[PDB]
Amino acid sequence: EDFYLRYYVGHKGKFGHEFLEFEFRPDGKLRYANNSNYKNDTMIRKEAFVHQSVMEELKRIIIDSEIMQEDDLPWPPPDRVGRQELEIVIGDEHISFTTSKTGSLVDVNRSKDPEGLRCFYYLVQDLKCLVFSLIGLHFKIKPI
């Protein structure tokens, strides 16, 4: 069954740029880049192949979130300050969302689709925890 997942978040903050991006390919390859620490001139860029059980848990988390049924049309668009991109292929279904950096409980609650935006927020946070754990323990580095 076809599979792909890529998430990117970037922003221009008071202290400068910042971006994080990771991708899981159908062959189990995890690629990760994180340059979120602007107090240093380095970047974190790593890759590794994860076991199929990891890819399966990933699909499980995505299916359970119900994100595959969401649509970003009514979502705030990316702006000159922040941008998030999430692309997923699972079997026949594919989705590609692009939006701004996630705002507050307040902002989301007043948006056109609070339910969909919350679903997006929690899925991204769950994917980040899994990715941070994988990179962090496998390379024995802060994933930051």
């Binding site: 062959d27 189990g28 390859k29 590794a48 192949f49 994860v50 076991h51 199929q52 059980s53 990891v54 399966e56 848990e57 499980r60 988390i61 929690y122 946070q125 769950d126 925890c129 899994l130 754990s133 994988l134 323990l137 496998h138 390379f139 024995k140």
Partner: protein, 92 residues
């Protein structure tokens, strides 16, 4: 492919973990097979329950394989868990 060791150890990926299980449950089942360097039993970011998976790292390949064969198919809180290598050496 085959198991890929991490920087300072071997990491197993545990799945189908009861949502109410906590680090205790993991420690109790896994310590017998070796010294555990790290356990990440991540919490679901919306609920605060365990999200269903854990990375368990052992100091040696011996320990991790012992645990693997002993714990894949076992149960925690009545729910059958699966235990696999977390990283592999090559594609597909």
């Amino acid at each position: 492919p085959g198991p890929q060791r991490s920087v300072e150890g071997w990491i197993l990926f545990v799945t189908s973990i009861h949502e109410e299980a906590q680090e205790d449950e993991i420690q109790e089942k896994f310590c017998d097979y070796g010294e555990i360097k790290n356990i990440h039993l991540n919490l679901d970011r919306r609920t605060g329950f365990s999200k269903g998976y854990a990375l368990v790292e052992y100091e040696t390949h011996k320990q991790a394989l012992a645990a693997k064969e002993a714990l894949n198919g076992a149960e925690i809180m009545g729910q059958t868990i699966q235990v696999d290598w977390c990283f592999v050496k090559g594609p597909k």
